[PDB]
Amino acid sequence: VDCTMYICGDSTECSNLLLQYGSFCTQLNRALTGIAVEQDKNTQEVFAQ
Amino acid sequence: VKQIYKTPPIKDFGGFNFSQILPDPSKPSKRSPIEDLLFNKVTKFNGLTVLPPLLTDEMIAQYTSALLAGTITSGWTFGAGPALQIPFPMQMAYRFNGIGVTQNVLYENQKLIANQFNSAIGKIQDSLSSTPSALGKLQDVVNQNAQALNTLVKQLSSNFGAISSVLNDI
Amino acid sequence: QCVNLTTRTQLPPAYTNSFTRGVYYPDKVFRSSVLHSTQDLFLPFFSNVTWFHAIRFDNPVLPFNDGVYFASTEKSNIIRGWIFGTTLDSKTQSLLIVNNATNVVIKVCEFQFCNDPFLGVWMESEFRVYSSANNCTFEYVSQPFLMKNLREFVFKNIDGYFKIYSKHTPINLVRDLPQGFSALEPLVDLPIGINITRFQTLLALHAAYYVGYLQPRTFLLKYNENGTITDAVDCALDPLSETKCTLKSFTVEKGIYQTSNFRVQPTESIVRFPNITNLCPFGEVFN
Amino acid sequence: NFNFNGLTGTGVLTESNKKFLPFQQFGRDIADTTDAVRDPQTLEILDITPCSFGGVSVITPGTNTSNQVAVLYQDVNCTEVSNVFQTRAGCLIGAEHVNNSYECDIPIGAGICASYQT
Amino acid sequence: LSRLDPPEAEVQIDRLITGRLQSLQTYVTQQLIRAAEIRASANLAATKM
Ligand SMILES: *[C@@H]1O[C@H](CO)[C@@H](O[C@@H]2O[C@H](CO)[C@@H](O)[C@H](O)[C@H]2NC(C)=O)[C@H](O)[C@H]1NC(C)=O
Ligand SMILES: *[C@@H]1O[C@H](CO)[C@@H](O[C@@H]2O[C@H](CO)[C@@H](O)[C@H](O)[C@H]2NC(C)=O)[C@H](O)[C@H]1NC(C)=O
Ligand SMILES: *[C@@H]1O[C@H](CO)[C@@H](O[C@@H]2O[C@H](CO)[C@@H](O)[C@H](O)[C@H]2NC(C)=O)[C@H](O)[C@H]1NC(C)=O
Numbered sequence: 105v106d107c108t109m110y111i112c113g114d115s116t117e118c119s120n121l122l123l124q125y126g127s128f129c130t131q132l133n134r135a136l137t138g139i140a141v142e143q144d145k146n147t148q149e150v151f152a153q
Numbered sequence: 154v155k156q157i158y159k160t161p162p163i164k165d166f167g168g169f170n171f172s173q174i175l176p177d178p179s180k181p182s183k184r185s186p187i188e189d190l191l192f193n194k195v196t197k198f199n200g201l202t203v204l205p206p207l208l209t210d211e212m213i214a215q216y217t218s219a220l221l222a223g224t225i226t227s228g229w230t231f232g233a234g235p236a237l238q239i240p241f242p243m244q245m246a247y248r249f250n251g252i253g254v255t256q257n258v259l260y261e262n263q264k265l266i267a268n269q270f271n272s273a274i275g276k277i278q279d280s281l282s283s284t285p286s287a288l289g290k291l292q293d294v295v296n297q298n299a300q301a302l303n304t305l306v307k308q309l310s311s312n313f314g315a316i317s318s319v320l321n322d323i
Numbered sequence: 324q325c326v327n328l329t330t331r332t333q334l335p336p337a338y339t340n341s342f343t344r345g346v347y348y349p350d351k352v353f354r355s356s357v358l359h360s361t362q363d364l365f366l367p368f369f370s371n372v373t374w375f376h377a378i379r380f381d382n383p384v385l386p387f388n389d390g391v392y393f394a395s396t397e398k399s400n401i402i403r404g405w406i407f408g409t410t411l412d413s414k415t416q417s418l419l420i421v422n423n424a425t426n427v428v429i430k431v432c433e434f435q436f437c438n439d440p441f442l443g444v445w446m447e448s449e450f451r452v453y454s455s456a457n458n459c460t461f462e463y464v465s466q467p468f469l470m471k472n473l474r475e476f477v478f479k480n481i482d483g484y485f486k487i488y489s490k491h492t493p494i495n496l497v498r499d500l501p502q503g504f505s506a507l508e509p510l511v512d513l514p515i516g517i518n519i520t521r522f523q524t525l526l527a528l529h530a531a532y533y534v535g536y537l538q539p540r541t542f543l544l545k546y547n548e549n550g551t552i553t554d555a556v557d558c559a560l561d562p563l564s565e566t567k568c569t570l571k572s573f574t575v576e577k578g579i580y581q582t583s584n585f586r587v588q589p590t591e592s593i594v595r596f597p598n599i600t601n602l603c604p605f606g607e608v609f610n
Numbered sequence: 611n612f613n614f615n616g617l618t619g620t621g622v623l624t625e626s627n628k629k630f631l632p633f634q635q636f637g638r639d640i641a642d643t644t645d646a647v648r649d650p651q652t653l654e655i656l657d658i659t660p661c662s663f664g665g666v667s668v669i670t671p672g673t674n675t676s677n678q679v680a681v682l683y684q685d686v687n688c689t690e691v692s693n694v695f696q697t698r699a700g701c702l703i704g705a706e707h708v709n710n711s712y713e714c715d716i717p718i719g720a721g722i723c724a725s726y727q728t
Numbered sequence: 729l730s731r732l733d734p735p736e737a738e739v740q741i742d743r744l745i746t747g748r749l750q751s752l753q754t755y756v757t758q759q760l761i762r763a764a765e766i767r768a769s770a771n772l773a774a775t776k777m
């Protein structure tokens with residue numbers, strides 16, 4: 105998930121207001137990326153034997 | 154271990170370099186060369202602090218070494234009953250028999266067995282030091298938790314719609 | 324003695340790469356064994372920056388925008404000074420920087436500037452920059468801006484304060500900035516309140532000048548044990564630099580990283596509504 | 611309680627073992643909090659140590675046999691809380707300390723654990 | 729942002745950004761918990777193999 109697009113993208117004012125929450129959604133963009141990486145790791149642990 | 158077991162006073166490990174694995178008594182920090190390599194690579198008033206462990210690195214090493222020393226010369230005989238006097242070469246003979254491998258391999262190739270373990274340990278020390286990322290299982294964990302905590306601090310600067318992000322400013 | 328030359332050399336701007344230069348240290352904070360990501364006005368790395376030669380000495384006027392970079396090469400008779408202002412048409416509190424035999428004079432006044440200003444030259448004379456001036460607001464004397472060593476400066480407007488920063492570096496190429504890492508620091512901080520828009524280099528009477536514009540870009544800066552910066556990365560200048568500011572490292576391990584986003588904006592606009600067979604009868608009354 | 615030319619916060623001044631560039635006025639930690647300041651009147655660098663602080667907990671036996679307990683103040687001086695034992699694990703007020711090792715009963719931290727004797 | 733006077737828009741925007749961010753956090757948290765269970769399942773599957 106792209107939290108800028110999700111919350112309100114293509115807007116100067118929405119971007120400036122979203123940034124007042126700091127890194128709160130950056131961490132979610134990161135958590136989802138991390139989950140996706142882990143899903144390939146799970147596949148490799150199960151099948152690449 | 155039920156109690157901490159002493160590493161035998163005589164290091165009869167059949168020529169194996171257990172001195173690289175078990176803590177070095179000559180140092181102020183009682184760690185083995187494997188441990189020194191890892192420990193040298195794997196690394197407030199804002200209200201966030203870190204509490205000490207009960208069991209210090211040396212204390213963990215004492216429990217770890219007891220289990221380890223037992224594992225190499227006596228197995229679990231220092232636990233389930235009184236200790237058994239199995240010399241390292243017989244512990245190894247039993248070790249091979251226990252996996253379906255004839256004991257003849259230990260005696261006929263005692264010198265090659267001694268060398269392969271030691272060679273591999275040396276390779277491990279070089280692998281971990283030449284490739285620091287090999288220690289990544291702990292380096293990433295400590296860095297990720299440190300980042301989460303540092304982020305918790307950085308987030309104090311956020312105003313969330315307020316005129317100011319600071320409570321004692323407003 | 325305002326002799327006008329209006330040389331108008333009309334040289335190609337000769338914009339060439341700034342490479343890894345153009346970084347200075349805007350803050351006053353000590354840091355060490357860290358990288359820090361800062362969004363500020365710096366020259367972009369490897370961006371093309373104009374190296375105009377006065378040499379018939381021309382005096383072109385370039386935009387200030389939100390801050391600029393300046394550097395120069397001089398021989399025997401050394402030119403040290405600038406003309407800055409909102410318009411430079413004798414209506415506002417323009418700033419002159421004039422270096423003389425013992426020190427540098429930083430002065431702000433409503434200077435009634437000449438069409439093609441210079442310093443007459445055993446002292447420099449401001450009378451050949453402007454014929455008169457009045458309603459003055461600032462004067463200060465600081466250390467000379469004099470040091471093969473290129474003189475380098477960065478100029479900024481911070482909430483009405485004009486800041487002047489400097490350092491020098493050895494020259495391998497007369498027409499190009501040397502490789503290495505810049506670290507300019509301020510000498511003066513001026514409380515003027517002037518909307519500086521235009522820069523003109525001030526030439527002394529008897530000449531190679533590098534002028535760039537700073538851009539609001541993020542730089543990842545590497546801080547050493549002394550509190551200074553030894554290196555830098557321009558965030559998302561190119562794909563390796565996207566990866567470096569994403570990871571907060573000057574070294575990237577072999578691998579694939581998620582660093583950016585591909586986004587396309589609408590450029591077209593479409594409005595459709597039903598066919599109207601019933602235009603409203605305003606005309607029944609109106610006409 | 612500090613105010614150095616407008617920069618505020620609290621802590622303990624000590625002489626710094628590091629120097630700032632002539633330009634730099636203040637120093638910062640990894641957390642971007644103040645680590646040190648330059649003295650605005652006499653140039654010199656002063657480190658700011660945080661004022662002693664930490665959590666407080668009580669070590670206690672079961673109330674069935676004893677009500678003799680001790681107070682633990684973490685990472686600080688014993689004077690900031692005669693039976694006083696100083697340790698980084700937290701200073702124990704209302705307890706003694708003995709050099710001989712024992713099996714652990716109630717853990718304190720950093721290699722030290724409380725126990726009770728008649 | 730296209731209907732309300734800027735300061736009023738900012739108040740209404742802050743309320744919605746917060747609500748939208750909370751929905752993303754909730755989803756991510758649920759995916760992290762489910763991911764922990766799926767990772768455990770994958771590790772068990774790998775063990776069975
Ligand atoms: C175990 O490995 C150590 C290395 O830590 C060996 O110590 C080396 O011994 C050789 C000759 O025996 C010396 O030339 C080196 O100077 C020693 N290195 C160090 C760092 O002291 C030790 O010999 C090995 N033990 C066995 C039984 O193989
Ligand atoms: C920062 O400046 C320090 C001055 O403290 C430099 O450290 C000195 O290095 C020279 C060169 O060997 C020695 O003669 C001095 O004894 C050192 N001073 C010390 C250790 O206090 C150092 O070179 C500089 N460091 C960086 C990273 O720029
Ligand atoms: C500001 O006041 C301080 C007073 O401590 C001065 O700092 C020192 O002053 C003493 C005696 O006045 C001198 O012996 C030292 O040499 C001074 N140290 C430094 C680093 O200057 C200081 O001179 C005063 N003035 C300024 C401009 O800082």
Ligand SMILES: *[C@@H]1O[C@H](CO)[C@@H](O)[C@H](O)[C@H]1NC(C)=O
Nearest residue numbers: 603604605606607608609610
């Ligand atoms: C009335 O007639 C005028 C003159 O032609 C014309 O411009 C206008 O469109 C008409 N207004 C309406 C409401 O029909």
Ligand SMILES: *[C@@H]1O[C@H](CO)[C@@H](O)[C@H](O)[C@H]1NC(C)=O
Nearest residue numbers: 670671672673674675676677
């Ligand atoms: C401990 O004290 C509780 C209440 O204070 C009491 O109910 C219990 O009987 C006591 N246990 C013993 C072993 O004395």
Ligand SMILES: *[C@@H]1O[C@H](CO)[C@@H](O)[C@H](O)[C@H]1NC(C)=O
Nearest residue numbers: 706707708709710711712727
């Ligand atoms: C502890 O150390 C002190 C200081 O050396 C010594 O006098 C004392 O006998 C020791 N106490 C015990 C119980 O060993």
